Design a protein around this ligand. Structure first.
Ligand code: NAG
Ligand code: NAG
Ligand code: NAG
Ligand code: NAG
Ligand code: NAG
Ligand code: NAG
Lengths: 49, 99, 49, 50, 137, 99, 49, 49, 50
């Protein structure tokens, strides 16, 4: 409430407070099951363009 | 490196100059020549690269040795430490729009 | 506005730029509306000796 | 220095006049981020690292 | 697609040419997981539907919290009390838990007797600082 | 303190002014929250975007303060209409209405 | 569900806080309207046969 | 509807509906008290006792 | 882009707030009329016509 109101003293009543309580600690990455590498050797190292 | 190499394979010397602007007392400055201080008058001012227009008064504030600028509300620089004389001058806007 | 410079100074023909050309030889205004065109002329301008 | 071990040098207690570099060295690349090159003369820097 | 939030299982059905979902068109509510073809819907991690009922700081430093439009049994799930500091775990659950139609109020003692309203919680429920000395609802 | 309706006016006005001066401290997606740094570090062709962002953010904050003032003025106008009606009907005469 | 929420809150939170205070004042005004219409006499009389 | 749940706020991108302070049961009881007092007493209903 | 998007959303919310101000003013006028009729005609007798 103090951080929402930007004051160290709050008055009597009910105050709607924005979220400051939860911070993410872990990260997950989900990609498709892809194994082979892209043929950039064919695109970039072709003998003729 | 070879002297017969291409332009994209030729040596290139790189110097990256990293600065920090208008946050701490400054030790390195530009080629601009300093002038006199006009107190209690509306004047264009340039303090350590900080340019502005307004009037200056003497201030009773005390600065820590690592502090250079002063902001009560953080959108206008109240007080500055004059670079030559170590007195602290606070800056009032020249505009008296309260009329 | 036609002139001849070297390659390393072609970057200085721009609004808001500094350098030897942009300070002492040819400066463009900040509110510049127009097109800067530059091409290499080693075959024409430069000569042996 | 090499690029894997680049040389960092502190610049302090001096006057940053780049106009002395006009005669000798021609810079192919000169790009300033967070500051304009025209306003570089009338500014004071706190710490400078090359 | 990078973000921060919580995921639940969804009953939505995606067409084979569809990957993302946007019912509100400014937030991706649903997504298709790339490895397993199940569809997971994404709820924001932020639970800002909480209102702090307090007296004056001059009077006291203890508060009550009204979690809006949630059931009292789902308060630890909704606010993610496992990932919170232990001081917020005091207001996650306890003896002073009251289920109102406005929400779940934790930190205030329910009393059967009724008085006039000074701090309007809502849905006919009010709060006050009354006697040792504590917040009553 | 049974005078909780008059202290609330002062508290609400002070809370609105705080909120305004807290919005004024934001940089509104610019390199600085003070105009002097933008004028000192950037030439006007690319400083104008930063100037527009900062001034637009300040003006929108002032607009929200104005709308809060309309709400407070509407509540105060309702209370003042009630006070004027009670002055005209009960101080200056007798009222047959109950409560 | 942005990956950075605290930075966005620090840059744009007081604006929404003022707007939410405006909406809360409107809601409180609605509650006072209901009270001034229906709760003028705060005496409960049982329904007579 | 007095039954709206948390899943609604996510749908509206933040916007929530706050319930009224006076329940329709409490408004109906105010109305019933006003009716009973009016029919029983008349002008003396608001005067106390 | 984030500044543009969030500023647009906040301006849209501000227009919603102003629409709520107009609606709340109309509802406040209707509620003042209802309270006056409650105090003058339910709780007593009114000599005003219509
Ligand atoms: C490209 O082809 C040349 C010629 O065979 C080879 O020497 C070089 O390693 C190739 N580069 C890549 C990235 O495959
Ligand atoms: C700077 O140098 C000038 C010229 O010698 C002198 O008058 C002035 O007092 C000096 N300021 C200092 C040392 O702060
Ligand atoms: C993806 O690969 C992992 C690793 O072998 C496997 O466990 C998983 O079942 C695979 N998923 C699909 C959909 O094939
Ligand atoms: C509360 O306010 C009074 C003045 O109204 C002051 O004398 C007292 O010290 C304050 N107490 C606290 C704990 O702030
Ligand atoms: C909350 O959960 C309890 C658990 O049985 C249930 O009885 C009650 O009806 C639930 N309340 C709501 C509003 O869903
Ligand atoms: C309040 O009423 C409930 C109804 O079940 C009862 O269990 C409880 O003991 C009562 N408390 C007091 C203090 O009367």
């Amino acid at each position: 409430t103090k951080c929402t109101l930007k004051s160290f003293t709050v008055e009597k009543g009910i105050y709607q407070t924005s979220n400051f309580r939860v911070q993410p600690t872990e990260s997950i990455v989900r990609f498709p099951n892809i194994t082979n590498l892209c043929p950039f050797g064919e695109v970039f190292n072709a003998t003729r363009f | 490196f070879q002297p017969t190499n291409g332009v994209g394979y030729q040596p290139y010397r790189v110097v990256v100059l990293s600065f920090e602007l208008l946050h701490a007392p400054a030790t390195v400055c530009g080629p601009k020549k300093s002038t006199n201080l006009v107190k209690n008058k509306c004047v264009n001012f340039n303090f350590n690269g900080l340019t502005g227009t307004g009037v200056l008064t003497e201030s009773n504030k005390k600065f820590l040795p690592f502090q250079q600028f002063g902001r009560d509300i953080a959108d206008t620089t109240d007080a500055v430490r004059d670079p030559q004389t170590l007195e602290i001058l606070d800056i009032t806007p020249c505009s008296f729009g309260g009329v | 506005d036609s002139f001849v410079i070297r390659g390393d100074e072609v970057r200085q023909i721009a609004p808001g730029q500094t350098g030897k050309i942009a300070d002492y030889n040819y400066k463009l205004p900040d509110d510049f509306t127009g097109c800067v065109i530059a091409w290499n002329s080693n075959n024409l301008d430069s000569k042996v000796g | 220095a090499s690029v894997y071990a680049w040389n960092r040098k502190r610049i302090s207690n001096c006057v940053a006049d780049y106009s002395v570099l006009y005669n000798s060295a021609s810079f192919s690349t000169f790009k300033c981020y967070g500051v304009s090159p025209t306003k570089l003369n009338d500014l004071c820097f706190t710490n400078v690292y090359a | 697609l990078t973000g921060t939030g919580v995921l639940t299982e969804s009953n939505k059905k995606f067409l084979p040419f569809q990957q993302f979902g946007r019912d509100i068109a400014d937030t991706t509510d649903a997504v298709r997981d790339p490895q397993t073809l199940e569809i997971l819907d994404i709820t924001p991690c932020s639970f800002g539907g909480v209102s702090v009922i307090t007296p004056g700081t001059n009077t006291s430093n203890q508060v009550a919290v009204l979690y809006q439009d949630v059931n009292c049994t789902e308060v630890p799930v909704a606010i993610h009390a496992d990932q919170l500091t232990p001081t917020w775990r005091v207001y996650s659950t306890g003896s002073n838990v009251f289920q109102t139609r406005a929400g779940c109020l934790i930190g205030a003692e329910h009393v059967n007797n009724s008085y006039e309203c000074d701090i309007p919680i809502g849905a006919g429920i009010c709060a006050s600082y009354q006697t040792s000395q504590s917040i009553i609802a | 303190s049974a005078l909780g309706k008059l202290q609330d006016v002062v508290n609400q006005n002070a809370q609105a002014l705080n909120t305004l001066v807290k919005q004024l401290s934001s940089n509104f997606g610019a390199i600085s929250s003070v105009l002097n740094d933008i004028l000192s570090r950037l030439d006007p062709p690319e400083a104008e975007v930063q100037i527009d962002r900062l001034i637009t953010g300040r003006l929108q904050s002032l607009q929200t303060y104005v709308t809060q003032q309309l709400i407070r003025a509407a509540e105060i106008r309702a209370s003042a209409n009630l006070a004027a009606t009670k002055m005209s009907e009960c101080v200056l005469g007798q009222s047959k209405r109950v409560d | 569900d942005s990956t950075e929420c605290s930075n966005l809150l620090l840059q744009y939170g007081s604006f929404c806080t003022q707007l939410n205070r405006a909406l809360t004042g409107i809601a409180v005004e609605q509650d006072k309207n209901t009270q001034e219409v229906f709760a003028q006499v705060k005496q409960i009389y049982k329904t007579p046969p | 509807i007095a039954a709206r749940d948390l899943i609604c706020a996510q749908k509206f991108n933040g916007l929530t509906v706050l319930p009224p302070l006076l329940t329709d049961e409490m408004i109906a009881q105010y109305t019933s008290a006003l009716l009973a007092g009016t029919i029983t007493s008349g002008w003396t209903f608001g005067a106390g006792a």
